Symmetry: C2
Subunit: 152 residues, 2 copies
């Protein structure tokens, strides 16, 4: 019987030796549902991308009540363990709830967010019909790159 | 439209401690079909397991002619680059033909052979209903273990 499971884990600093470092997380999906292209996926995303995601979803579903995100960057300090953990929990809760909703499950944005390398610009390009590649193509190409699959 | 692609590659010698040696191969599937559980898979199998597979398939589809397997087995010398290559080619051709056939595509044995770690004893157990886990379970657990998922 159909299930979908999601973990957010493994916080890591990025561009650490630059100005403009940021923290991102790993998002792992495991499902047996027809809804997803891949039954498993791990992808890395940061809070600002979750924000984009939330608002993208909100604007295609005016009547839907999106779940909360955890606290904003302004109130986030990576040296406070409790911060980084609260953020990860919150981002898990957010996705868990989102994924319980079939209308949202039907948004290619969410799928590309979860099962592709594409950033928000390209996601928007892709679901709006303006890229050479389809949504399925992008997802498959991510799995091949990501699983170091040989051949083609 | 739906596609399915298979490669057999990366022959390797397997040296269990003893005077025990064999070659196995990597079998990689890439598909976008609803027929398969996973859209990608890489698993390692050996010639003898193919032999098992072919007889198992033959016996659940008694009206289908199965493509042949490569036939030079006694002769075969795993230190002859060309022997091992001629094999892997044959095993690719075997699977490619097999997969073009929808009756065979609906045999769980094939799926477990391609998308799980289970060996033949367990495959048989599993498709017979004698294991605690289902077929879908075994395939999903393989992908999780294999993709180092938490």
């Amino acid at each position: 019987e159909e299930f979908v499971s999601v973990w957010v884990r493994d916080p890591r600093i990025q561009k650490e030796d630059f100005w403009h470092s940021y923290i991102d997380y790993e998002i792992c999906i495991h499902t047996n549902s027809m809804c997803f292209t891949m039954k498993t996926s791990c992808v890395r995303r940061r809070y600002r991308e979750f924000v984009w995601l939330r608002q993208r979803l909100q604007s295609n579903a005016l009547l839907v009540q999106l779940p909360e995100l955890p606290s904003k960057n302004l109130f986030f300090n990576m040296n406070n363990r409790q911060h980084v953990d609260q953020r990860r929990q919150g981002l898990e809760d957010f996705l868990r709830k989102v994924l319980q909703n079939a209308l949202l499950l039907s948004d290619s944005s969410l799928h590309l967010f979860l099962q592709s390398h594409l950033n928000s610009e390209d996601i928007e390009a892709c679901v709006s019909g303006q890229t050479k590649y389809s949504v399925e193509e992008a997802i498959h190409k991510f799995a091949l790159m990501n699983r170091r699959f040989p051949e083609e």
